[PDB]
Design a protein around this ligand. Structure first.
Ligand SMILES: NC(=O)c1ccc[n+]([C@@H]2O[C@H](COP(=O)([O-])OP(=O)(O)OC[C@H]3O[C@@H](n4cnc5c(N)ncnc54)[C@H](OP(=O)(O)O)[C@@H]3O)[C@@H](O)[C@H]2O)c1
Ligand SMILES: NC(=O)c1ccc[n+]([C@@H]2O[C@H](COP(=O)([O-])OP(=O)(O)OC[C@H]3O[C@@H](n4cnc5c(N)ncnc54)[C@H](OP(=O)(O)O)[C@@H]3O)[C@@H](O)[C@H]2O)c1
Ligand SMILES: CCCCCCCCOC(=O)c1cc(O)c(O)c(O)c1
Lengths: 315, 315
């Protein structure tokens, strides 16, 4: 079950989410990625940001080496972090990711965020410690550098993440554009279903990839603990009962049936193996309209901190 | 079961595909071509590109020598590789093919691809960066040189491969045209059935010859491994069950009943002998419409570098 991307490549519609907070030992990423592959996940989502590309890659390489999978069966995503937006930093950042994971190519490379951050090396030992420094980069030139990565065979497909419609149009309207982004990976779930942005993406042949599809990890560092817990929704629970599934499985299936490619992070063996059951059942059209009704414009990514960045996607 | 070509020659409607990847020992092509002829294949498709003309030729000569066939019962195709498009290179390339095969004439010589490549001795000439080097040739002059090869009795018939409608018209409308292409050998299967091109070809008396009719060899170099596997299609499988045949046989029969000449590669003795069974059954008109419904405009062969060639046939 794969979707055809606008560059002709194919992306599995269910992806494994690998991010876990820095308290979680990195050896866990190695363990759980092997478990994900053993359960049937083939699309694996990582990033320079996650500090896990080595462990994730070693999982992949391990399952390739022992003959459970071929490299060609695995669809591996990495992402260009925001301190590397300047065009001359793009290819080395990809190369660094490739060396960490010990892969020859990534199946997909994304611009992680339109919110560029100061690159390079400070120069004093402490002056800038702790601060968050924004940078200003024309993301079109970032995108050209991405296009060159694809032409070098380093990334099979290239795309973006956390872009809004305006930011997508800026790439789409670039003079001399060679490759459209294949996807826009954004927060998407029944509390923030992104239907308008989805319609836009579909009209341009860009796949929407949903993160926090199960309602986020609710990380204390950001997420308001009084925000409603997605998987406790009564409509999601009643559909789970009706179908003899679970609220997670309902929420994942919802995305698949609206043409969205869905990620699901779990570091728990049983939930990982549950999540692959998404292909065993289907929601009715009426079920789908009921889930559409749950939208409350709720972003679990309380980016509030970054709200004054000129490229903040919700300004 | 032959079709009358527009030059008066006859082409068998089922052809044996001889390409195998370079990991396959070169001796196999000799073995499998003999097996193909023993099974009933009479049309045999090779090319300079395949690096097997000696072995394929030996097979053909063997079966002629031992009396299983006469030379005139065999239809042998070779192809002019893209580094040899320049008019003065066309006849020596054909002569080199003929000397390798140890044959005096080919039944058919094709321009392999409209995508001309830098002349020389590499098959895939590459620049400093590893990028393939294109050439620019007026393919009308290539065609004139092909016309001369037919007049010299070195090729009984001439045609083209991987041409689109525009590229065909260019030849058809050439001033002083002597011979129309007898055929256009193109990627064609239920996921990319080419009906519009086929209608055009039929209106001009040009036979469409299908390659990757069984969904290609899915070579990593050119095919996305997560593309759908044609012979696993549930409609093909259900028709196979209905007819007590196989999905390969359904896919081959489809082509024959729409007036398409169809190639089938196999290096496996039992699949080779299965493939000749295509003449034992027939699909209903409803079966044919059901297969027509599978079209998803999917060409298995892809290349970022070749996509940017001015003569790329899918642009
Ligand atoms: N592009 C971006 O900027 C961006 C942002 C956020 C996320 N992402 C990507 O998207 C991935 C997923 O998003 P996310 O990390 O917010 O998490 P998510 O997929 O919404 O999952 C949230 C929580 O659901 C739990 N869970 C998983 N399967 C379950 C089931 N079947 N039943 C009940 N609970 C279940 C997990 O807990 P356990 O681990 O305990 O099972 C997990 O922490 C990330 O890991 C990352 O790859 C990208
Ligand atoms: N003009 C061009 O540019 C061009 C391009 C591509 C191909 N071609 C020509 O067309 C030929 C055929 O196309 P192709 O090589 O892409 O392969 P194909 O005919 O689409 O066959 C694909 C695969 O199907 C398998 N197969 C054959 N019979 C089968 C059966 N009865 N059941 C299940 N599987 C079966 C074969 O594997 P096994 O060998 O293991 O049986 C083969 O590798 C080539 O050999 C070449 O002559 C030309
Ligand atoms: C004070 C500002 C903190 C900056 C650090 C970012 C805050 C949130 O980090 C994450 O947990 C996170 C997880 C993912 O899966 C993502 O892709 C992603 O983009 C972010």
């Amino acid at each position: 079950q794969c979707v055809k991307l606008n560059d002709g490549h194919f992306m599995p519609v269910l992806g494994f989410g690998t991010y876990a907070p820095p308290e979680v030992p990195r050896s866990k990423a190695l363990e759980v990625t092997k478990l994900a592959i053993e359960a049937g996940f083939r699309h694996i989502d990582s990033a320079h940001l996650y500090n896990n590309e080595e462990q994730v890659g070693l999982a992949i390489r391990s399952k390739i080496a022992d003959g459970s999978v071929k490299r060609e069966d695995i669809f591996y995503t990495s992402k260009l972090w925001s301190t590397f937006h300047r065009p001359e930093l793009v290819r080395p950042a990809l190369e660094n990711s490739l060396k960490k994971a010990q892969l020859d190519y990534v199946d997909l490379y994304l611009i992680h965020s339109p919110m560029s951050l100061k690159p390079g090396e400070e120069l004093s030992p402490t002056d800038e410690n702790g601060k968050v420094i924004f940078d200003i980069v024309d993301l079109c030139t970032t995108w050209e550098a991405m296009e060159k990565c694809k032409d070098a065979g380093l990334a099979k497909s290239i795309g973006v993440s956390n872009f809004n419609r305006r930011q997508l149009e800026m790439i789409l309207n670039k003079p001399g554009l060679k490759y459209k982004p294949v996807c826009n990976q954004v927060e998407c779930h029944p509390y923030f279903n992104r239907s308008k942005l989805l319609d836009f993406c579909k009209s341009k042949d860009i796949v929407l990839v949903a993160y926090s599809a199960l309602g986020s990890q609710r990380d204390k560092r950001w997420v308001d603990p009084n925000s409603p817990v997605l998987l406790e929704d009564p409509v999601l629970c009643a559909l789970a009962k009706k179908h003899k599934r679970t609220p997670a499985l309902i929420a994942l299936r919802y995305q698949l049936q609206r043409g969205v490619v869905v990620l699901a992070k779990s570091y728990n063996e049983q939930r990982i193996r549950q999540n692959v059951q998404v292909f065993e059942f289907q929601l009715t059209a009426e079920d789908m309209k009921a889930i559409d009704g749950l939208d409350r414009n709720l972003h679990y990514f309380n980016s509030d901190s970054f709200a004054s960045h000129p490229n903040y996607p919700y300004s």
